[PDB]
Amino acid sequence: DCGLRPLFEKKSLEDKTERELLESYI
Amino acid sequence: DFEEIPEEYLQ
Amino acid sequence: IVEGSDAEIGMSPWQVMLFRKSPQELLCGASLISDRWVLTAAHCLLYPPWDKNFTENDLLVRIGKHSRTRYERNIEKISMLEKIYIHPRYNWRENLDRDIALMKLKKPVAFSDYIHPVCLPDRETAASLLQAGYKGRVTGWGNLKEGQPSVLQVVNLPIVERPVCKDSTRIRITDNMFCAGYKPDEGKRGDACEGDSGGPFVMKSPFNNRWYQMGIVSWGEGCDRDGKYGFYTHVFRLKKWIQKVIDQFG
Ligand SMILES: Cc1cnc(NCC(F)(F)c2ccccn2)c(=O)n1CC(=O)NCc1ncccc1F
User: Fold this and answer.
1) CA distances from C152 to C67, C79, C111, C112 (A)
2) One domain, residues C127 and C113
3) Which positions bear Sulfotyrosine (chain B)?
């Protein structure tokens, strides 16, 4: 269950800057 | 400037 | 953290605070990798040059926090240490090579909305994500400039090419380290700073949406200096030792 945050991934909500990370994995 | 933590932990 | 921003509640449930009993103060960051184990930088516990040599009963681990100084009643959990394990080949004499340490908690901590373990990378995840240009995230309650934040800070930094890392310092860099940060001409900035040591450098896998800890805040020369970069302990490179310790003492 590691790496899945109760307040984010578990609820399908994203934090305000994770998109920056994902966009860098071009 | 740390807030005093419960003595139950400092014991 | 320099040039970072306030973290959201529950944004880094694996973030741990290494707290000194007497006097009460912030020693370093750390991370929760299981209900019984915490991962941090060996230099947070042992560093003879500065007469630093902390034992089990000298520290406390505070999990689930947001505020740096306040005792977050009903939210954070404080734990005692049963045993500390420092890498036998930790090089404190020269370049902090193998700057890693594991801490066994007295009792398992219960998870919650604010307390949750981060994943350790497998060979494949590490191979596909640990690449120059790819961004990771660093968190901590360390200084904001080379003064102190009210709550946990966060900053996203790109991994830097090994050649550039090497050419930015006189320190001998090993395969057990990697550096991160923006280049002086990229505009944006940010970096870890004093108090952030031992903290986690994490990345989110676009394959299974999980967060993995790829590095540990290890060392740097100043904070957010142009042409300089922060150095992190390469967690995967040392996973053999990590696994050895856990299944042999846990
Ligand atoms: C223990 C220690 C000793 N010397 C440090 N820097 C000086 C140095 F870079 F020249 C160095 C590196 C390795 C061994 C001896 N000296 C250092 O960075 N740490 C660890 C430390 O203070 N880490 C905190 C930190 N980590 C990343 C960026 C900024 C920052 F303050």
Assistant:
1) 6, 19, 19, 18
2) no
3) 9
Backbone angles phi, psi at C168, to 5 degrees: -100, -10
Q: Tell me the two tokens of residue C50.
A: 């500065």
Which of residues 1 through 20 in chain A touch C, CB cutoff 8 A? 1-9, 15-18, 20
- Residue C96 in contact with ligand 1 by CB distance below 6 A: yes
Half-sphere exposure of C95 (CA within 13 A, CB side): 16
> Please, which residues have CB within 8 angstroms of residue A14's CB and are 6 or more apart in sequence?
A8
Q: Is C99 a catalytic residue?
A: yes
Cα B7 off chain centre by: 5
Whether residue C7 is found in the same domain as residue C86:
no
Does residue C214 sit in helix, strand or coil? strand
> Within the 79-108 window of chain C, which residues sit less than 8 Å (CB to CB) from chain B?
80
CATH code, A20: 4.10.140.10
- Determination technique for this PDB entry? X-ray
Rounded to whole angstroms, the Cα distance separating C153 from C137 reads: 11
Alpha helix stretches (DSSP H) within chain C: 123-129, 162-166, 239-249
Determine whether the shortest distance from the Cβ of C87 to ligand 1 is under 6 A.
no
**DSSP of C100-119, one letter per residue?**
-EEEEESSPPPP-SS--PPB
For residue C149, whether the previous peptide bond is cis, meaning omega lies within 30 degrees of 0, is no
